[PDB]
């Protein structure tokens, strides 16, 4: 199902007119297309480049498929009419001649044996007269932009004769048919059966085709080539007898999705997501749709793309799915492709890890809270960072919190450590440090990494007995009383006592609570002083002694307890109510 779900959208995108390589071809990224006249005579070396900031090498021309050269005598293979600045010009940037001239001795051979088998084309007779020139090819090096194709190793030049103007020599409706004939005769006399993917006879394809976009080089996604990965003496592709017509389909299915908008990194794991076979598009809804509705394979991938993007957008919505999205989360090994994810499941089922991420991360917010309901990871991790989210450690943090969030894994200790660092370093617990600590501690509980404690809740737990959480609440009420006593404070007992009330409660809370009677005295509403003192009595009723030192477990609680109680105090009528029910 890993590949029959790729074959079964090649057969969908090839039938949704989405423009996928048709049965013999490949959307190869040809950077430095060659222009020739009708009888040779190199005209121009156009570069079909200029895309995303790393100038990806060429407009994807859907040219005859890359033949997977890959060998010591790699020169013999010679892709049909597009290959290489070493195959087209015999120019070796770093490979040396006789490893580029023998390439050109075979690329010219390939073109010519095409020309004999495909005459009166004026496109291949042109290039076959351009590949029997040795001078116009020399003129290719003396081109205006040749110096920029020599810069890109493995440049793929291809032969657009002039007077076709978009259509390559390998695009004419004879080379197009030749490839549709050279992938229907030569790749049909091979090992007769039987398909792994489709199950049909469909002659077996040894050498699956170089799935591009995963690795540093197009690597054969399914490729058993070492002395023992071969199971039954099957030798490299008969270990997995996938037909040529099916091998091509899923290879060019990955190739487009790793080159399309389907590709997106879940985290450090480039993933191709495509909608499964959509339901028959119930009649009423299909009444308005013309055709009617078509199963565009990559249609609602956004639902899943904007699910993992929701972890950074903070725009997570609990989804109701039943629209199943294939999500093949491949990743490079070295030059194999490691399927790290495979999910035919719905986006609702995929969300169960981000939902648990944004439910373990749920934290109290008052009214008109400037904080998002589900707080974006970059803005969430920005509460761990020095002052702006780029220095949060790209290996135990932003790159691992995401893996701990995308997968409902345990948030690393490096959050308590980092979130606590910032709690007592910014001298305040931003929503985002309280929320992130709530997520850490909830998952530490759920993993049995935080044994005695019970999972935190959104709200303040006017309970919880936790010698760190209740002192966090105590600090929250103490600082609320101070900020209620002195509205404009320059050094709240946060900014002055937090670093040691969080981590060392006897050092401080024995002296915060001498400031406390004075703060209560200064409350202009003495009844408000009574209410706040009542709740600090309630808070401190759960406390039997300020601990000498708060474990890393509880300084997270302190921060969570602080934020819980401080958003309880800044609730509409919470303290007035809770006081009035006593």
């Amino acid at each position: 199902m890993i590949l029959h779900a790729l074959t079964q959208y090649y057969q969908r995108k090839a039938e949704s007119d989405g423009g996928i390589a048709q049965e013999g071809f490949e959307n190869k990224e040809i950077p430095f297309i060659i222009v020739i006249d009708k009888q040779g005579n190199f005209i121009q070396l156009e570069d079909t480049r200029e895309l995303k900031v790393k100038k990806k090498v060429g407009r994807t021309f859907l040219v005859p498929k890359g033949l997977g050269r890959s060998g010591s005598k790699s020169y013999e293979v010679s892709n049909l009419l597009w290959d290489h600045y070493g195959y087209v010009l015999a120019y070796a940037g770093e490979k040396g001649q006789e490893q580029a001239d023998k390439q050109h001795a075979s690329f010219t051979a390939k073109v010519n044996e095409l020309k004999q088998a495909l005459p009166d084309d004026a496109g291949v007779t042109a290039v076959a007269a351009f590949l029997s020139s040795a001078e116009e090819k020399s003129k290719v090096m003396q081109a205006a932009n040749w110096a920029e194709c020599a810069k890109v190793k493995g440049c793929n030049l291809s032969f657009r004769l002039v007077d076709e103007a978009v259509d390559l020599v390998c695009q004419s409706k004879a080379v197009r048919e030749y490839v549709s004939q050279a992938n229907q005769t030569q790749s049909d006399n091979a090992q007769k059966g039987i398909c792994l993917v489709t199950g049909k006879a469909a002659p077996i394809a040894r050498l699956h085709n170089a799935v591009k976009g995963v690795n540093a080089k197009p690597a054969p996604f399914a490729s058993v080539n070492l002395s023992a990965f071969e199971s039954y003496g099957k030798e490299q592709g008969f270990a997995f007898p996938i037909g040529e017509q099916a091998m091509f389909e899923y290879t060019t299915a990955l190739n487009t999705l790793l080159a399309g908008e389907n590709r997106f990194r879940i985290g450090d794991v480039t993933t191709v997501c495509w909608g499964a076979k959509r339901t028959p598009l119930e009649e009423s809804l299909a009444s308005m749709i013309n055709g009617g509705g078509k199963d565009n394979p990559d249609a609602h991938i956004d639902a899943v793309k904007a699910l993992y993007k929701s972890l950074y957008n903070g725009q997570y919505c609990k989804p109701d799915g039943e629209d199943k999205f294939y999500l093949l989360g491949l990743s490079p090994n070295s030059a194999r492709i490691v399927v790290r994810f495979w999910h035919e499941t719905t986006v609702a089922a995929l969300s169960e890890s981000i939902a648990a991420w944004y439910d373990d991360l749920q934290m109290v917010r008052g009214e008109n809270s400037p904080y998002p309901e589900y707080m974006p990871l970059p803005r969430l991790l920005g509460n761990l960072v020095l002052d702006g989210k780029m220095e949060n450690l790209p290996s135990d943090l932003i790159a691992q919190i995401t893996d701990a969030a995308l997968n409902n894994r345990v948030l690393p200790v490096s959050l308590l450590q980092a979130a606590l660092r910032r709690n007592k370093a910014e001298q305040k617990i931003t929503y985002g440090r309280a929320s992130l600590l709530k997520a850490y501690i909830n998952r530490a509980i759920r993993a049995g990494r935080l044994k005695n404690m019970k999972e935190l809740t959104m709200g303040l737990d006017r309970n919880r007995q936790d010698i760190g959480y209740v002192l966090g609440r105590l600090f929250a009420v103490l600082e609320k009383i101070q900020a209620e006593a002195n509205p404009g404070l320059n050094a709240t007992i946060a900014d002055r006592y937090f670093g040691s009330a969080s981590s060392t409660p006897i050092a401080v809370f024995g002296t915060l609570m001498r400031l406390l009677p004075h703060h209560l005295n200064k409350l202009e509403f003495e009844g408000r002083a009574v209410q706040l003192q009542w709740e600090i009595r309630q808070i401190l009723e759960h406390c039997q002694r300020f601990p000498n030192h708060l474990n890393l477990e509880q300084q997270g609680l302190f921060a969570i307890g602080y934020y819980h109680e401080t958003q309880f105090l800044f609730t509409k009528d919470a303290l007035k109510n809770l006081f009035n029910e006593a």
Partner: protein, 757 residues
């Protein structure tokens, strides 16, 4: 109650816009706003556009924020959208919810950015509150009929044979325009105190800058036709009339999608309007839109159109937008937020960007594009990067929106017929475009302003100092090199013998227009009398933007015929020269940096070396250039035609991405950053101020002559918000790339009188 809009009256009173009549009037207004398209369909979003305004909370915020009966920012757009999605249909509901929940937050995506799927699922509580408000006091239960069976009519009255998915987004934006126009025209009919828009309340001439539409045609365009034809009868006006005699015969035929193939000086700006207002009167077209790639031809058409039609010509530079005030702007400029004027002339980056917009403000116009005649002058600069979305939407608009896109560029945009590579229809473009010129090719030969000389077909490249000597040999040489750095190199290669004038994007738009104005009067001295000092102008694509320069001879770097045509337009502009001007293309050093520019040369080169470009100003060679050009970059850049293809599934029907396909829809690819380098433009020394932008060419250079001794200062950047005075800043920026910044540490005032650093 319920208080749709709380306007603190100018008399320190407070008037309440009753949400009853607010929704009723908006629906009625955006029932006429849509024609056969969404007449009763857009109203069902007009009825609902501010349903959430019924929120018991919002009826505590609009009071709190607007000071009615004495700060939370309560959402209200989503509630009407959720109401729609639950009541009408999963299709029609989401269709209508795009409009509704976007009506203030801008058109939203279903998934990616500002996702509707999120907002609706989170609108359940908000919809409960707002619907409780709706039912609580007033508003008879059959006030929101949302009659899907009746609403199925105007959907199927327009979507004959079902809803095309790949262009269902155009309603989602056009009917969105109907809603946002109606709500804005009604909120600001109450933010100004008229309590109505469609009626004489905001139809009063003091409200929204009314302008004559069809009566003015017979008066004033016929006036300037007669007063221009009777002026002269020479080698011109015998073909200018030959243009605007078939441009007038072309208005009869239906052919909803047209194109004007007229070269420079052939009544391009006078017959494009001429065809439009004859095809506007005929085919019930209520508006004429005239779109320009750059805000330079915008001036040359503002002047011409006002000289034709007085003051009706409404405009938005979108870059300059000069800062004159007091009801000449901000009254007529209040009529161009939505183009509710018969003759709107702006750029096809405030047309198409807005015509493909999602933002609430930008989207108010697709109303007025539909059932108009959009004219695209210099349309050959419609970005091939965004050529597929632009051409599909203009094709759809032509097909069923009653528009007539006019491609009144010099050569043509080959905006596709079906440029299909294998079987797939790449850029499924405009079907059967009529060249309103009877003979496209021979007329460009008949109206050939300049004979052109390409570089030798071999690969030899003329050197920078070589072409410096070449242009030193003849006077008044425009020299348009491809890069700003090529402009610096050419300016660093010219002798001090003659005046060398540098013009690259390393300069400021006001300083730019100053340079063009002084070049214009230098040319005038060359014609009327003579300038003994040699004249030339080192330039980049800036002169390529239709600036009125009559250069006898133009050497232009090796790049696209699109740009070669523009260079030729600056050579022998308006004629009055001897037999022909002389434009020569030089294959400069390394050329055409990257992007569309490098593909520009790689096409123009690949023709002259291959037997094409026999006359590389003929339209047949130009269409060949564009035919090559489209199909050489991705004719659809980032995704846009795929983003807006409606993508209907039973669970998430009609999941168009809009703020994804508006944010990614950037015609101006302003890659990098924009630095403002203060070049003191000029001053009248009459308590000066006066950036003097559009009278630079006339007022300054008639009082103070061309002797390069002008002294005047105008300092800006008061560092105040002021909500205005913004076009003294980035009216004067320059746009280095991100590569040129870390090699500069800011080092202000380093931008010289010829360019920046």
């Amino acid at each position: 109650d319920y208080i749709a809009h709380a306007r603190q009256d100018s008399s320190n009173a407070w008037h309440s816009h009753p949400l009853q009549k607010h929704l009723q009037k908006v629906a009625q207004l955006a029932k006429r706003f849509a024609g056969r398209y969404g007449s009763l369909f857009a109203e069902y979003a007009g009825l609902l556009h501010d349903l959430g305004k019924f929120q018991e909370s919002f009826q505590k915020y609009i009071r709190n924020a607007s000071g009615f009966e004495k700060l939370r920012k309560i959402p209200h757009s989503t509630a009407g959208a959720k109401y729609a999605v639950e009541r009408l249909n999963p299709f029609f509901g989401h269709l209508l919810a795009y409009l509704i929940a976007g009506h203030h937050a801008g058109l939203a995506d279903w998934y990616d950015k500002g996702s509707l799927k999120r907002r609706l699922q989170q609108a359940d509580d908000e919809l409960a509150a707002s619907l409780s408000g709706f039912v609580e006091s007033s508003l008879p239960e059959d006030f929101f009929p949302l009659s899907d069976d009746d609403l199925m009519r105007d959907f199927f009255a327009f979507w004959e044979d079902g809803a095309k998915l790949e262009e269902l987004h155009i309603w989602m934006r056009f009917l969105f325009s109907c809603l946002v126009d109606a709500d804005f025209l009604d909120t600001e009919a109450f933010m100004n105190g008229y309590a109505d828009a469609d009626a004489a309340a905001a139809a009063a001439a003091a409200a929204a800058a009314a302008a004559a539409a069809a009566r003015r045609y017979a008066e004033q365009y016929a006036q300037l036709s007669a007063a221009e034809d009777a002026d002269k009868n020479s080698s011109l006006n015998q073909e200018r009339h030959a243009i605007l005699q078939q441009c007038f015969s072309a208005a009869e035929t239906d052919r909803t999608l047209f194109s004007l193939t007229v070269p420079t000086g052939g009544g391009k700006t006078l017959a494009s309007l001429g065809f439009a207002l004859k095809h506007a009167l005929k085919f019930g077209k209520k508006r004429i839109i005239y779109a320009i790639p750059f805000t330079s031809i915008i001036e040359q058409n503002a002047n011409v159109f006002r000289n034709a039609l007085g003051d009706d010509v409404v405009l938005e530079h979108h870059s300059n937008l000069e800062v004159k005030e007091d009801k000449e702007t901000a009254k007529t400029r209040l009529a161009t937020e939505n183009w509710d004027a018969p003759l709107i002339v702006t750029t096809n980056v405030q047309l198409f960007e807005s015509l493909f917009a999602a933002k609430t403000s930008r989207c108010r116009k697709i109303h007025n594009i539909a059932d108009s005649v959009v004219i695209l002058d210099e349309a050959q600069q419609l970005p091939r990067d965004f050529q597929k979305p632009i051409t599909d939407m203009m094709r759809v608009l032509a097909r069923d929106y009653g528009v007539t896109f006019v491609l009144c560029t010099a050569t043509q945009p080959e905006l596709g017929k079906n440029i299909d590579a294998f079987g797939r229809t790449i850029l499924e473009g405009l079907p059967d475009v009529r060249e309103i010129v009877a003979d496209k090719i021979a007329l460009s030969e008949k109206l050939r302003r300049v004979r052109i000389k390409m570089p030798p077909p071999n690969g030899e490249t003329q050197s920078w100092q070589k072409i410096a000597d070449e242009i030193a040999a003849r006077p008044c040489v425009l020299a348009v090199v491809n890069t700003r750095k090529h402009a610096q190199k050419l300016f660093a290669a010219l002798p001090s013998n003659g005046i060398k004038l540098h013009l690259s994007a390393n300069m400021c738009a006001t300083h730019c227009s100053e340079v063009i104005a002084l070049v214009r009067r230098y040319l005038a001295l060359y014609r009327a009398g003579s300038l003994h000092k040699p004249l030339w102008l080192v330039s980049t694509q800036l002169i390529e933007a239709g600036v009125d320069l009559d250069f006898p001879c133009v050497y232009r770097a090796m790049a696209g015929l699109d740009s070669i045509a523009q260079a030729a337009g600056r050579c022998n502009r308006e004629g009055k020269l001897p037999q022909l001007g002389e434009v020569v293309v030089f294959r400069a050093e390394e050329g055409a940096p990257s992007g569309s520019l490098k593909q520009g040369q790689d096409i123009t080169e690949e023709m002259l070396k291959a037997g094409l470009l026999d006359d590389p100003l003929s339209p047949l060679a130009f269409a060949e250039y564009f035919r090559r050009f489209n199909g050489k970059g991705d004719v659809d850049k980032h995704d846009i035609t795929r983003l807006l293809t409606a993508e209907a599934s039973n669970e998430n029907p009609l999941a168009i991405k809009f703020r994804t396909a508006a944010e990614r829809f950037h015609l101006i690819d302003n890659q990098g950053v924009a630095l403002i380098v203060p070049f003191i433009p000029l001053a009248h020394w009459e308590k000066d101020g006066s950036p003097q932008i559009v009278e630079a060419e006339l007022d300054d250079f008639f009082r103070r002559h061309l002797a390069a001794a002008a002294a005047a200062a105008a300092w800006a950047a008061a560092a105040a918000a002021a909500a205005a005075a913004f076009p003294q800043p980035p009216d004067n920026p320059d746009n280095p790339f991100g590569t040129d910044q870390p090699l500069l540490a800011a080092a202000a005032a380093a931008a010289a009188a010829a360019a920046a650093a």
